[PDB]
Structures are given as structure tokens and as C-alpha cells.
């Protein structure tokens, strides 16, 4: 059947006249991943909007519009259409026209990426606003978007996973629930009735440490100390011996004034192996290399592998000139998105499931693993980010894991 839990049904009904909490100005759902909160939240938003207004404008925001469409709008579309709603997607325009029982409203899509994101939601007048991944958004974009919700009866809807305790959304919204007159429902995987006791426990084994506390337990816990505290040389390091690899990639972090790194990654029996590393530090050497010199080193680095098994070079986005040279030379290139927090989370998960393993010649990588830490002072201000020192192999690994194994 795939039935809804008690907590999911509250998301669907809170706003109705029969509900005790219908006068609340909005809702916040936070907590764990895979909790079946995102799709009910979005469905309930459209349902509430279509039932309460006609010919109004409504907002929907993600970290980017692309992500919003992937995470919410596409599954929301399919689900809306199956229960008698109709949808038109004005692609470039970035809004939807939704129709139900002779009523029509307009749903505008936004991205809340940076301090300029606030400038794109100044004109429009709104009867509601929905934020997916609000803990990934700037406070300024959310202050504006909420200020554009001027129509009488307007409600605010927030969906997120936890960040740190000092994060603005925890401090200004979740700790001020009665002040803002919002409802709050906290989800864990127990609220998702379609997951067995086995599958829930499998998801539990994908996370340890801070990311386990946030994405499984749903706790707003501070990031502190070693980032990859699940990395373990008893489990993640293997001998440097030949294996019959079926597929290869190279991942690259670029530096002229910082080190440049290559990692050769090789697939064997379901696991991607870091076969070796290249580590050129121009500062230590007292000699900087050019794009051409690094191209030459990269050709040496991949000499002894069959060209039909090499699937390309994953490159740090800022190395645009280097990418042009590689394409000019016939080398396939994939630009890494460089989504930092999601990449770090995904590297951690790759280690926990042993999706990756390292040859013991990757000695520079291992030195970075032992030193790569969270920015302590930033975390205590609400900003989760690494201290960007001795992370040149680790950034390349992240590009590889995040581009090929996730995404
Ligand atoms: Cl969800
Ligand atoms: Cl979030």
C-alpha cells in the first residue's frame, strides 16, 4: 500500500479548518534523511495553496533551481497528476501553472545560493513560500522571500536536514517557534513506514560521527575536529599490487602556487581503488609548473593503461585553461561540481561502506586524512567548512567520489 505515518498525515492536514493548529503561520519539518517528509511537505503545500486561494502566486525555493527540480518538482509533478491535478511547466520562465477543480494558481521557482539571491525575489507578490533544504540557504534570501509573502492568509513552509546548532535557521526559527507562531515536526526514519527494520539499519551503517548524528538521528550537532574520523588504516588501505581493473579515471586538484595532484582510480569487483597519487608542490620544490608541464606529467601518469579503459580526467573547475589544453589534446574532461559539504559527506559514506580503498603508496593522501579538520570558529558562527590546508589530495578524491560514485 505504502501508507502514511501519523507524522506524515499531520503535514498533510495541519492547515485544514478541522485541525487545532490551522492558525499557525507555517510549518518546519527537519530531521533525518529518507523519512518521507519532503514529498508530503511539497504535496501538502500545493494542496493547501489550491484549496485556499485562486489566481495567486506561490514561491518554491531550493539551494539551486536545478536541485529543487530534481529533489521536489519532478516527483511532485508525477504525484500531483495522479490525484487529479494538472500541471504546466514554463521551463525557462521558472514557474508552474497548476489546475484543480476549476481553480488555478501559479508556482514560482527560486534558488537561494548566495548573498545576491535576495535580489531575484524583490518584485513578485506571494500567497506562500516553500523552502527545501533551507539550512543550505543564506539568511538574507529567506528574510526577503518571507517579506514578499504579503497576501493575507499566507503561510511559510520549511523542509531541511540539520546543520550545526549555531546555524541561523536553528537560532532564528527553531529556537523561536512560539515567537514566529510556527508548527515543528521532527522526522526520523521511523516515520517512513515503507522502510523495514533491515533497510533502516543498512542506512544507519552508511554514516558515522557528526554525519550520523545529523542525517540519521536528526540532531543539529556542531562540526568539530577531524573531518574524516571514520578513515582507518586497518580497513581502508590495501597493498600496492596489480589488479585486473575494468575501468579508470584520473581526478585532479590544480595548483600553481599550491600543490597539484592526480589520483588514478580503478574499478575492480565493485570497489574503486586509488591506485596511485601524484603530488607536485611548487613551493617546496622552488619551481612552478605550467599547464603544459602538468599535461606532460599526466600523460606519464597514465602511460601504462589501455586507452579503451580510461574514461577521462575529473578536474577542479577553476582550472579552465588546463581543461582547454586537455580537450585540445583529445583527453576527455569532466568538470567537478565542487559542492563541498555534500562531497565531504559522500566521501565519508564511501569510506563507511568501503566503496573506495587506497593502495598503500598513497602516503600523502593518508597524511592529509590525519590533519583535515573543521573550521572551529566558523562552526561556532553557524558556518560548516573545512580549514583549507593540506587538502590537495583530499579535494581530488572528493571530486572523484562526488562525480562518479554519487551525482
Ligand atoms: Cl525526505
Ligand atoms: Cl537542509
Numbering used by the authors: 11 to 417
Which text from the study accompanies this structure?
Most dsDNA bacteriophages and viruses utilize a powerful DNA translocation motor to package their unit-length genome into a preformed procapsid. A central component of the motor, large terminase, consists of an N-terminal adenosine triphosphatase (ATPase) domain comprising ASCE (Additional Strand Catalytic glutamate) and lid subdomains, and a C-terminal nuclease domain, connected by a short linker sequence. While both domains are involved in interaction with DNA DNA translocation is powered by the ASCE subdomain using energy released coinciding with ATP hydrolysis. The nuclease domain is responsible for cleavage of the genomic DNA concatemer at both the initiation and completion stages of viral DNA packaging.
Subsequent soaking of these crystals in cryo-protectant containing a high concentration of NaCl resulted in a transition from R32 to C2 crystal form (Crystal form 2) with each of the ATPase domains of the three subunits related by the crystallographic 3-fold axis adopting a unique stable position. In the resulting C2 crystal form, there are three molecules in the asymmetric unit, each having a slightly different domain orientation, with an overall inter-subunit Cα rmsd of 0.8–1.6 Å. In this structure, the N-terminal ATPase and the C-terminal nuclease domains, tethered by a linker, adopt vastly different relative orientations to those observed in large terminases from other bacteriophages. From the lid subdomain, the polypeptide chain leads, through an ordered linker comprising 12 amino acids (230–241), into the C-terminal nuclease domain. Interestingly, the β-hairpin, previously predicted to interact with DNA, has an extended hairpin-like loop structure with an α-helix at its tip. The relative position of the ATPase and nuclease domains is stabilized by a salt bridge formed between R224 of the lid subdomain and D394 of the hairpin-like loop, and an interdomain hydrogen bond (M216-N362). There are also additional ATPase-nuclease domain–domain interactions resulting in a total surface area buried between the two domains of 362 Å2. It is possible the distinct domain arrangement of the D6E large terminase stabilized by these interactions represents a biologically important conformationally locked inactive ‘initiation’ state that serves to prevent futile hydrolysis of ATP before assembly of this extremophilic motor.
